[PDB]
Amino acid sequence: ADRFAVSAEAENKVREQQPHVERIFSVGVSVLPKDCPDNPHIWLQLEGPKENASRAKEYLKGLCSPELQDEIHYPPKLHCIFLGAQGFFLDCLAWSTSAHLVPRAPGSLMISGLTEAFVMAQSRVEELAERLSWDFTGVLRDFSALLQSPGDAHREALLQLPLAVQEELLSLVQEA
């Protein structure tokens, strides 16, 4: 009950995203050798804790047949969230939602996955973008503590984010 099947013609996408799934979800993903090369499907095998494997499966299924797909737009000063801190906040959003998330030109993020994974990631980005225009404790203190990666080119843009955005990012990282 550890293995699940996806369409055989998605093997490319799976093999390309393998390192990125293993890194974000701390699992091992293996493409089992298929029993007949004309099979319409291939079997994938996941290794690791139960929670990770479950989220990694949602991610892999959403990668192989996305039910929803769209580019989400937002003010470019938010873009540093998705590139900064060596991808940490993007990684947490992928772990939180199992959506496939790909930054584009500053101001834009490609979101795809299963229906609920997509909707959950899109709603979260809209909340962060919404909080850009709010007006407001040691939130700056706890937020700075997340920025522990060396040589972060985006460290300045992150720290000039409004407190409302920083606090919401703290909520994201400090979740299930």
mmCIF file of all heavy atoms in Angstrom, residues 114-140:
data_model
loop_
_atom_site.group_PDB
_atom_site.id
_atom_site.type_symbol
_atom_site.label_atom_id
_atom_site.label_comp_id
_atom_site.label_asym_id
_atom_site.label_seq_id
_atom_site.Cartn_x
_atom_site.Cartn_y
_atom_site.Cartn_z
ATOM 1 N N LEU A 114 -3.403 19.238 -7.983
ATOM 2 C CA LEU A 114 -4.759 18.798 -7.747
ATOM 3 C C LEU A 114 -5.611 19.997 -7.325
ATOM 4 O O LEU A 114 -5.109 21.030 -6.859
ATOM 5 C CB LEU A 114 -4.767 17.701 -6.686
ATOM 6 C CG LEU A 114 -3.960 16.436 -6.984
ATOM 7 C CD1 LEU A 114 -4.193 15.390 -5.918
ATOM 8 C CD2 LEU A 114 -4.244 15.862 -8.384
ATOM 9 N N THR A 115 -6.917 19.859 -7.506
ATOM 10 C CA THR A 115 -7.815 20.993 -7.300
ATOM 11 C C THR A 115 -7.590 21.677 -5.961
ATOM 12 O O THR A 115 -7.359 22.888 -5.896
ATOM 13 C CB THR A 115 -9.247 20.522 -7.422
ATOM 14 O OG1 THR A 115 -9.414 19.958 -8.722
ATOM 15 C CG2 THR A 115 -10.207 21.671 -7.222
ATOM 16 N N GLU A 116 -7.626 20.911 -4.880
ATOM 17 C CA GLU A 116 -7.490 21.532 -3.572
ATOM 18 C C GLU A 116 -6.072 22.048 -3.323
ATOM 19 O O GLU A 116 -5.911 23.083 -2.664
ATOM 20 C CB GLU A 116 -7.937 20.551 -2.491
ATOM 21 C CG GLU A 116 -9.416 20.235 -2.623
ATOM 22 C CD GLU A 116 -10.009 19.568 -1.394
ATOM 23 O OE1 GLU A 116 -9.607 19.962 -0.267
ATOM 24 O OE2 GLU A 116 -10.891 18.681 -1.566
ATOM 25 N N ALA A 117 -5.037 21.378 -3.845
ATOM 26 C CA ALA A 117 -3.679 21.902 -3.675
ATOM 27 C C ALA A 117 -3.530 23.266 -4.348
ATOM 28 O O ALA A 117 -3.045 24.225 -3.734
ATOM 29 C CB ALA A 117 -2.645 20.911 -4.217
ATOM 30 N N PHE A 118 -3.961 23.373 -5.606
ATOM 31 C CA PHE A 118 -3.978 24.660 -6.306
ATOM 32 C C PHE A 118 -4.737 25.725 -5.525
ATOM 33 O O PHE A 118 -4.237 26.836 -5.319
ATOM 34 C CB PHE A 118 -4.625 24.502 -7.687
ATOM 35 C CG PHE A 118 -4.725 25.784 -8.462
ATOM 36 C CD1 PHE A 118 -3.744 26.115 -9.403
ATOM 37 C CD2 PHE A 118 -5.780 26.664 -8.256
ATOM 38 C CE1 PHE A 118 -3.817 27.281 -10.115
ATOM 39 C CE2 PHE A 118 -5.875 27.848 -8.976
ATOM 40 C CZ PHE A 118 -4.884 28.161 -9.911
ATOM 41 N N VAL A 119 -5.976 25.426 -5.133
ATOM 42 C CA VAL A 119 -6.792 26.453 -4.497
ATOM 43 C C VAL A 119 -6.127 26.919 -3.213
ATOM 44 O O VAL A 119 -6.116 28.110 -2.893
ATOM 45 C CB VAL A 119 -8.219 25.934 -4.267
ATOM 46 C CG1 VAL A 119 -9.019 26.932 -3.451
ATOM 47 C CG2 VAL A 119 -8.889 25.680 -5.609
ATOM 48 N N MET A 120 -5.510 25.994 -2.495
ATOM 49 C CA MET A 120 -4.894 26.326 -1.219
ATOM 50 C C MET A 120 -3.656 27.196 -1.420
ATOM 51 O O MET A 120 -3.415 28.128 -0.648
ATOM 52 C CB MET A 120 -4.555 25.032 -0.473
ATOM 53 C CG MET A 120 -4.264 25.192 1.011
ATOM 54 S SD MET A 120 -3.704 23.627 1.764
ATOM 55 C CE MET A 120 -2.764 24.255 3.177
ATOM 56 N N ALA A 121 -2.864 26.922 -2.453
ATOM 57 C CA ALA A 121 -1.697 27.764 -2.708
ATOM 58 C C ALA A 121 -2.113 29.131 -3.223
ATOM 59 O O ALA A 121 -1.564 30.155 -2.800
ATOM 60 C CB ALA A 121 -0.747 27.092 -3.705
ATOM 61 N N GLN A 122 -3.083 29.172 -4.138
ATOM 62 C CA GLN A 122 -3.536 30.456 -4.658
ATOM 63 C C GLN A 122 -4.116 31.336 -3.559
ATOM 64 O O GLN A 122 -3.833 32.541 -3.499
ATOM 65 C CB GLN A 122 -4.561 30.246 -5.753
ATOM 66 C CG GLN A 122 -5.346 31.493 -6.029
ATOM 67 C CD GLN A 122 -6.300 31.315 -7.175
ATOM 68 O OE1 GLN A 122 -6.187 32.026 -8.166
ATOM 69 N NE2 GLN A 122 -7.245 30.352 -7.061
ATOM 70 N N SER A 123 -4.929 30.760 -2.678
ATOM 71 C CA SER A 123 -5.500 31.567 -1.607
ATOM 72 C C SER A 123 -4.403 32.123 -0.698
ATOM 73 O O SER A 123 -4.533 33.232 -0.162
ATOM 74 C CB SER A 123 -6.535 30.748 -0.838
ATOM 75 O OG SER A 123 -5.882 29.971 0.146
ATOM 76 N N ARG A 124 -3.316 31.372 -0.517
ATOM 77 C CA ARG A 124 -2.260 31.811 0.384
ATOM 78 C C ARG A 124 -1.469 32.961 -0.213
ATOM 79 O O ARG A 124 -1.011 33.856 0.514
ATOM 80 C CB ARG A 124 -1.318 30.653 0.698
ATOM 81 C CG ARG A 124 -0.526 30.884 1.947
ATOM 82 C CD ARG A 124 -1.393 30.395 3.068
ATOM 83 N NE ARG A 124 -1.042 30.948 4.361
ATOM 84 C CZ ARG A 124 -0.726 30.195 5.398
ATOM 85 N NH1 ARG A 124 -0.628 28.879 5.282
ATOM 86 N NH2 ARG A 124 -0.515 30.774 6.579
ATOM 87 N N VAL A 125 -1.228 32.907 -1.523
ATOM 88 C CA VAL A 125 -0.505 33.986 -2.190
ATOM 89 C C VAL A 125 -1.346 35.252 -2.199
ATOM 90 O O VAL A 125 -0.838 36.357 -1.958
ATOM 91 C CB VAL A 125 -0.094 33.562 -3.607
ATOM 92 C CG1 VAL A 125 0.383 34.759 -4.384
ATOM 93 C CG2 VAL A 125 0.986 32.496 -3.517
ATOM 94 N N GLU A 126 -2.653 35.107 -2.445
ATOM 95 C CA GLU A 126 -3.538 36.266 -2.445
ATOM 96 C C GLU A 126 -3.580 36.910 -1.070
ATOM 97 O O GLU A 126 -3.608 38.140 -0.956
ATOM 98 C CB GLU A 126 -4.937 35.851 -2.881
ATOM 99 C CG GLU A 126 -5.254 36.217 -4.313
ATOM 100 C CD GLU A 126 -6.093 35.149 -5.033
ATOM 101 O OE1 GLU A 126 -6.793 34.356 -4.345
ATOM 102 O OE2 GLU A 126 -6.034 35.097 -6.295
ATOM 103 N N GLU A 127 -3.537 36.094 -0.014
ATOM 104 C CA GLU A 127 -3.497 36.646 1.335
ATOM 105 C C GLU A 127 -2.205 37.426 1.574
ATOM 106 O O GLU A 127 -2.238 38.549 2.097
ATOM 107 C CB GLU A 127 -3.663 35.517 2.360
ATOM 108 C CG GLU A 127 -3.575 35.962 3.832
ATOM 109 C CD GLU A 127 -4.853 36.664 4.340
ATOM 110 O OE1 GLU A 127 -5.933 36.475 3.724
ATOM 111 O OE2 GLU A 127 -4.782 37.397 5.361
ATOM 112 N N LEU A 128 -1.065 36.876 1.143
ATOM 113 C CA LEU A 128 0.192 37.599 1.293
ATOM 114 C C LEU A 128 0.163 38.905 0.490
ATOM 115 O O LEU A 128 0.529 39.973 1.001
ATOM 116 C CB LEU A 128 1.354 36.696 0.863
ATOM 117 C CG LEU A 128 1.773 35.595 1.841
ATOM 118 C CD1 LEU A 128 2.647 34.494 1.181
ATOM 119 C CD2 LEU A 128 2.490 36.180 3.041
ATOM 120 N N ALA A 129 -0.317 38.842 -0.759
ATOM 121 C CA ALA A 129 -0.426 40.049 -1.576
ATOM 122 C C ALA A 129 -1.396 41.047 -0.964
ATOM 123 O O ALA A 129 -1.152 42.260 -0.978
ATOM 124 C CB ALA A 129 -0.870 39.692 -2.993
ATOM 125 N N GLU A 130 -2.509 40.552 -0.434
ATOM 126 C CA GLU A 130 -3.482 41.426 0.212
ATOM 127 C C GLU A 130 -2.857 42.170 1.379
ATOM 128 O O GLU A 130 -3.023 43.387 1.512
ATOM 129 C CB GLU A 130 -4.672 40.577 0.675
ATOM 130 C CG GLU A 130 -5.469 41.142 1.833
ATOM 131 C CD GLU A 130 -6.527 42.133 1.386
ATOM 132 O OE1 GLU A 130 -6.960 42.029 0.214
ATOM 133 O OE2 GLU A 130 -6.905 43.015 2.203
ATOM 134 N N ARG A 131 -2.062 41.465 2.184
ATOM 135 C CA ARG A 131 -1.475 42.044 3.374
ATOM 136 C C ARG A 131 -0.403 43.072 3.062
ATOM 137 O O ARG A 131 -0.002 43.807 3.966
ATOM 138 C CB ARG A 131 -0.934 40.914 4.245
ATOM 139 C CG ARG A 131 -2.061 40.067 4.830
ATOM 140 C CD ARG A 131 -1.565 38.768 5.433
ATOM 141 N NE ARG A 131 -1.310 38.924 6.857
ATOM 142 C CZ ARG A 131 -2.100 38.459 7.809
ATOM 143 N NH1 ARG A 131 -3.209 37.810 7.516
ATOM 144 N NH2 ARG A 131 -1.761 38.648 9.085
ATOM 145 N N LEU A 132 0.025 43.182 1.804
ATOM 146 C CA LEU A 132 0.980 44.221 1.434
ATOM 147 C C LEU A 132 0.484 45.621 1.804
ATOM 148 O O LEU A 132 1.301 46.499 2.114
ATOM 149 C CB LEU A 132 1.266 44.151 -0.064
ATOM 150 C CG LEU A 132 2.514 43.386 -0.471
ATOM 151 C CD1 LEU A 132 2.533 43.177 -1.974
ATOM 152 C CD2 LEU A 132 3.757 44.127 -0.005
ATOM 153 N N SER A 133 -0.838 45.854 1.811
ATOM 154 C CA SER A 133 -1.352 47.212 1.979
ATOM 155 C C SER A 133 -1.981 47.469 3.345
ATOM 156 O O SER A 133 -2.671 48.475 3.511
ATOM 157 C CB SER A 133 -2.395 47.503 0.911
ATOM 158 O OG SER A 133 -3.484 46.624 1.092
ATOM 159 N N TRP A 134 -1.665 46.662 4.348
ATOM 160 C CA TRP A 134 -2.212 46.839 5.684
ATOM 161 C C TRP A 134 -1.289 47.734 6.505
ATOM 162 O O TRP A 134 -0.109 47.899 6.182
ATOM 163 C CB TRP A 134 -2.374 45.488 6.388
ATOM 164 C CG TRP A 134 -3.384 44.570 5.767
ATOM 165 C CD1 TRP A 134 -4.055 44.766 4.600
ATOM 166 C CD2 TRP A 134 -3.827 43.300 6.280
ATOM 167 N NE1 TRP A 134 -4.883 43.700 4.352
ATOM 168 C CE2 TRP A 134 -4.762 42.786 5.365
ATOM 169 C CE3 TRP A 134 -3.516 42.546 7.422
ATOM 170 C CZ2 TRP A 134 -5.402 41.546 5.554
ATOM 171 C CZ3 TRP A 134 -4.152 41.298 7.608
ATOM 172 C CH2 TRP A 134 -5.081 40.820 6.678
ATOM 173 N N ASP A 135 -1.829 48.294 7.592
ATOM 174 C CA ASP A 135 -1.048 49.096 8.533
ATOM 175 C C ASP A 135 -1.163 48.549 9.955
ATOM 176 O O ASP A 135 -2.264 48.465 10.509
ATOM 177 C CB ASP A 135 -1.472 50.563 8.505
ATOM 178 C CG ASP A 135 -0.513 51.444 9.297
ATOM 179 O OD1 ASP A 135 0.718 51.313 9.092
ATOM 180 O OD2 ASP A 135 -0.988 52.246 10.139
ATOM 181 N N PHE A 136 -0.016 48.219 10.552
ATOM 182 C CA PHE A 136 0.058 47.768 11.945
ATOM 183 C C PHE A 136 0.837 48.762 12.821
ATOM 184 O O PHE A 136 0.518 49.957 12.884
ATOM 185 C CB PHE A 136 0.707 46.374 12.024
ATOM 186 C CG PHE A 136 -0.219 45.233 11.622
ATOM 187 C CD1 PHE A 136 0.231 43.913 11.648
ATOM 188 C CD2 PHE A 136 -1.546 45.476 11.244
ATOM 189 C CE1 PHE A 136 -0.616 42.846 11.284
ATOM 190 C CE2 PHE A 136 -2.403 44.418 10.877
ATOM 191 C CZ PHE A 136 -1.931 43.098 10.900
ATOM 192 N N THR A 137 4.847 44.440 19.576
ATOM 193 C CA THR A 137 5.169 43.019 19.474
ATOM 194 C C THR A 137 6.519 42.856 18.761
ATOM 195 O O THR A 137 6.963 43.766 18.047
ATOM 196 C CB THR A 137 4.063 42.254 18.723
ATOM 197 O OG1 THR A 137 3.894 42.814 17.417
ATOM 198 C CG2 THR A 137 2.712 42.485 19.382
ATOM 199 N N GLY A 138 7.188 41.720 19.004
ATOM 200 C CA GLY A 138 8.415 41.354 18.313
ATOM 201 C C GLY A 138 8.233 40.443 17.105
ATOM 202 O O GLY A 138 8.792 39.344 17.057
ATOM 203 N N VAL A 139 7.432 40.866 16.127
ATOM 204 C CA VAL A 139 7.244 40.060 14.925
ATOM 205 C C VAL A 139 8.471 40.170 14.025
ATOM 206 O O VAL A 139 8.967 39.167 13.498
ATOM 207 C CB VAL A 139 5.955 40.472 14.191
ATOM 208 C CG1 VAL A 139 6.060 40.178 12.696
ATOM 209 C CG2 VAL A 139 4.774 39.736 14.777
ATOM 210 N N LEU A 140 8.966 41.396 13.821
ATOM 211 C CA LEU A 140 10.237 41.563 13.129
ATOM 212 C C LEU A 140 11.309 40.665 13.726
ATOM 213 O O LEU A 140 12.143 40.130 12.989
ATOM 214 C CB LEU A 140 10.693 43.027 13.162
ATOM 215 C CG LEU A 140 11.879 43.326 12.237
ATOM 216 C CD1 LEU A 140 11.548 42.978 10.808
ATOM 217 C CD2 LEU A 140 12.270 44.779 12.307
#
